[PDB]
Enzyme design. Structure first.
Site, mmCIF file in Angstrom:
data_model
loop_
_atom_site.group_PDB
_atom_site.id
_atom_site.type_symbol
_atom_site.label_atom_id
_atom_site.label_comp_id
_atom_site.label_asym_id
_atom_site.label_seq_id
_atom_site.Cartn_x
_atom_site.Cartn_y
_atom_site.Cartn_z
ATOM 1 N N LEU A 145 0.826 -1.212 0.000
ATOM 2 C CA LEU A 145 0.000 0.000 0.000
ATOM 3 C C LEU A 145 0.852 1.250 0.000
ATOM 4 O O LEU A 145 0.446 2.280 -0.519
ATOM 5 C CB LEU A 145 -0.916 0.024 1.224
ATOM 6 C CG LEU A 145 -1.675 -1.282 1.493
ATOM 7 C CD1 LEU A 145 -2.424 -1.230 2.826
ATOM 8 C CD2 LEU A 145 -2.612 -1.654 0.326
ATOM 9 N N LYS B 154 2.186 -3.636 8.971
ATOM 10 C CA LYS B 154 3.314 -2.753 8.878
ATOM 11 C C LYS B 154 4.582 -3.507 9.304
ATOM 12 O O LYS B 154 4.574 -4.251 10.286
ATOM 13 C CB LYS B 154 3.097 -1.531 9.746
ATOM 14 C CG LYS B 154 4.213 -0.540 9.647
ATOM 15 C CD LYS B 154 3.972 0.641 10.517
ATOM 16 C CE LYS B 154 2.910 1.476 9.919
ATOM 17 N NZ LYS B 154 2.424 2.431 10.908
ATOM 18 N N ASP C 143 0.951 15.396 11.968
ATOM 19 C CA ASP C 143 0.923 15.370 10.479
ATOM 20 C C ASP C 143 -0.517 15.321 10.002
ATOM 21 O O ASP C 143 -0.867 14.512 9.143
ATOM 22 C CB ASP C 143 1.721 14.173 9.913
ATOM 23 C CG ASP C 143 2.173 14.368 8.438
ATOM 24 O OD1 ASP C 143 2.880 13.452 7.916
ATOM 25 O OD2 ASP C 143 1.883 15.429 7.834
ATOM 26 N N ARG D 1 -3.928 13.558 3.018
ATOM 27 C CA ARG D 1 -3.153 12.379 2.661
ATOM 28 C C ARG D 1 -3.060 11.386 3.839
ATOM 29 O O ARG D 1 -2.842 10.218 3.635
ATOM 30 C CB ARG D 1 -1.761 12.783 2.168
ATOM 31 C CG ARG D 1 -0.938 13.510 3.227
ATOM 32 C CD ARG D 1 0.489 13.848 2.773
ATOM 33 N NE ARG D 1 1.125 14.601 3.849
ATOM 34 C CZ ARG D 1 0.989 15.913 4.046
ATOM 35 N NH1 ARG D 1 0.351 16.664 3.172
ATOM 36 N NH2 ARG D 1 1.531 16.487 5.106
ATOM 37 N N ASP E 179 -1.176 6.506 12.714
ATOM 38 C CA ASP E 179 0.192 6.983 12.701
ATOM 39 C C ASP E 179 0.921 6.320 11.536
ATOM 40 O O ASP E 179 1.372 5.191 11.643
ATOM 41 C CB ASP E 179 0.892 6.703 14.007
ATOM 42 C CG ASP E 179 2.255 7.345 14.053
ATOM 43 O OD1 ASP E 179 2.674 7.930 13.017
ATOM 44 O OD2 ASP E 179 2.874 7.309 15.118
HETATM 45 C C1 LIG Z 1 -0.577 2.097 12.703
HETATM 46 O O1 LIG Z 1 -0.048 1.514 11.495
HETATM 47 N N1 LIG Z 1 -0.874 1.590 10.385
HETATM 48 C C2 LIG Z 1 -0.501 2.247 9.178
HETATM 49 O O2 LIG Z 1 0.586 2.780 8.976
HETATM 50 C C3 LIG Z 1 -1.373 2.026 7.935
HETATM 51 C C4 LIG Z 1 -0.936 2.465 6.719
HETATM 52 N N2 LIG Z 1 -1.713 2.569 5.577
HETATM 53 C C5 LIG Z 1 -1.280 3.525 4.432
HETATM 54 C C6 LIG Z 1 -1.401 5.007 4.827
HETATM 55 C C7 LIG Z 1 -1.091 5.941 3.650
HETATM 56 C C8 LIG Z 1 0.332 5.837 3.202
HETATM 57 C C9 LIG Z 1 0.616 4.391 2.868
HETATM 58 C C10 LIG Z 1 0.133 3.318 3.899
HETATM 59 C C11 LIG Z 1 -2.977 1.930 5.515
HETATM 60 N N3 LIG Z 1 -3.734 1.946 4.376
HETATM 61 C C12 LIG Z 1 -4.994 1.267 4.422
HETATM 62 N N4 LIG Z 1 -5.657 1.382 3.193
HETATM 63 C C13 LIG Z 1 -5.204 1.816 1.844
HETATM 64 C C14 LIG Z 1 -5.650 1.171 0.664
HETATM 65 C C15 LIG Z 1 -5.201 1.529 -0.603
HETATM 66 C C16 LIG Z 1 -4.296 2.577 -0.830
HETATM 67 C C17 LIG Z 1 -3.676 2.852 -2.202
HETATM 68 C C18 LIG Z 1 -2.713 1.688 -2.639
HETATM 69 N N5 LIG Z 1 -1.922 1.927 -3.903
HETATM 70 C C19 LIG Z 1 -1.540 3.348 -4.114
HETATM 71 C C20 LIG Z 1 -0.623 3.329 -5.351
HETATM 72 C C21 LIG Z 1 -0.069 1.917 -5.403
HETATM 73 C C22 LIG Z 1 -0.664 1.187 -4.189
HETATM 74 C C23 LIG Z 1 -3.853 3.197 0.331
HETATM 75 C C24 LIG Z 1 -4.290 2.849 1.629
HETATM 76 N N6 LIG Z 1 -5.464 0.655 5.531
HETATM 77 C C25 LIG Z 1 -4.661 0.713 6.597
HETATM 78 C C26 LIG Z 1 -3.412 1.313 6.691
HETATM 79 C C27 LIG Z 1 -2.637 1.281 7.950
HETATM 80 O O3 LIG Z 1 -3.095 0.684 8.946
#
Ligand SMILES: CONC(=O)c1cn(C2CCCCC2)c2nc(Nc3ccc(CCN4CCCC4)cc3)ncc2c1=O
Length: 279
Positions: A33, A58, A149, A153, A167
């Site tokens: 992700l 993570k 932050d 985004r 976080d």
């Molecule tokens: C406490 O720890 N948790 C986190 O850091 C999480 C991080 N990210 C994210 C937070 C945002 C930054 C990245 C991790 C998550 N993203 C989703 N969902 C999600 C689904 C699809 C996308 C897009 C995927 N594509 C984009 C281009 C190619 C792949 C982004 C998020 N669900 C949960 C988390 C965390 O728990």
């Protein structure tokens, strides 16, 4: 940077409870992700959790050393101690033995708010996102936890397009994102945080106002066309504020203006924001 528990709600302890341990063999990894300099998050299926569930996991990258493994354990410890809330990405499990440290959290299937805003959307939906984030932030403030932050985004959308904050600092692609200024998200930061490196719940409130502007502009970059440079800092110091976005009712713009009071104590609290929004 990342989430932090500060002193005075009362802070009794500075946060690993093995109640969270989950067997890594019961996870199957899927797609990535996102990733930062030292961390990455992948979507996964977890079998028998708590239930077969899509989850987010993570973990560290190869580039990480003991300093970073500690920051990851420290994030796990904060999460374990905060407790649960509907508008936070909640902790579900961890794998700290038998391999690299894995932190397991709720998966938000619609991705981030910024991209969702940019891609019909109704005024009531925008107000809901705004309220949902405010509720998560009031929760954090009630735990003496600062986010540092706040930004579109960094808001995710899950089932029902419900907003959650989390976080994401270790898995955020900071080095390749020009919104982080050699690395801080300066266009979202309160002046006291830029000019004194002071960070408080009230500084988070300023950032919340910037987020509101993102939501009600449907994803414009803040301070459109203005470069981050000496002139930019003088503007914010001197009380410059962005114009009302095209889709913000005037009462919503009044929340922004309040969040952008130069005096931190003249800013509203997140509970006051939630209360006003509910009205
Ligand atoms: C406490 O720890 N948790 C986190 O850091 C999480 C991080 N990210 C994210 C937070 C945002 C930054 C990245 C991790 C998550 N993203 C989703 N969902 C999600 C689904 C699809 C996308 C897009 C995927 N594509 C984009 C281009 C190619 C792949 C982004 C998020 N669900 C949960 C988390 C965390 O728990």
């Amino acid at each position: 940077v990342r989430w932090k528990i500060i002193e005075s709600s009362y802070t009794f302890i500075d946060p690993y409870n093995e109640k969270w341990e989950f067997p890594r063999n019961n996870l199957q990894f899927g797609k990535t992700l996102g990733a930062g300099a030292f961390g990455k998050v992948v979507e996964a299926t977890a079998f028998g959790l708590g239930a077969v569930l899509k989850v987010a996991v993570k973990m560290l990258k190869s580039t990480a050393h003991a300093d970073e493994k500690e920051a990851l354990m420290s994030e796990l410890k904060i999460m374990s101690h905060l407790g649960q809330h509907e508008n936070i990405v909640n902790l579900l499990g961890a794998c700290t033995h038998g391999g690299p440290v894995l932190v397991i959290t709720e998966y938000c299937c619609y991705g981030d708010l910024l991209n969702f805003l940019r891609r019909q959307l109704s005024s009531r939906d925008l107000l809901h996102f705004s309220s949902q984030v405010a509720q998560g932030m009031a929760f954090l403030a009630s735990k003496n936890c600062i986010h540092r932050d706040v930004a579109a985004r960094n808001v995710l959308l899950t089932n029902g397009h419900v907003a959650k904050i989390g976080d994401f600092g270790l898995a955020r692609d900071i080095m390749n994102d020009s919104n982080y200024i050699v690395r801080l998200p300066v266009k979202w930061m309160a002046p006291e945080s830029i000019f004194d490196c002071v960070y408080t719940v009230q500084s988070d409130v300023w950032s919340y106002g910037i987020l509101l502007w993102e939501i009600f502009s449907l994803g414009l970059n803040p301070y459109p066309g203005i470069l981050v440079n000496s002139k930019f800092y003088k503007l914010v110091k001197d009380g410059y504020q962005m114009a009302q976005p095209a889709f913000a009712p005037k009462n919503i713009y009044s929340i922004m203006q309040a969040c952008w009071a130069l005096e931190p104590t003249h800013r509203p609290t997140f509970q006051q924001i939630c209360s006003f929004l509910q009205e």
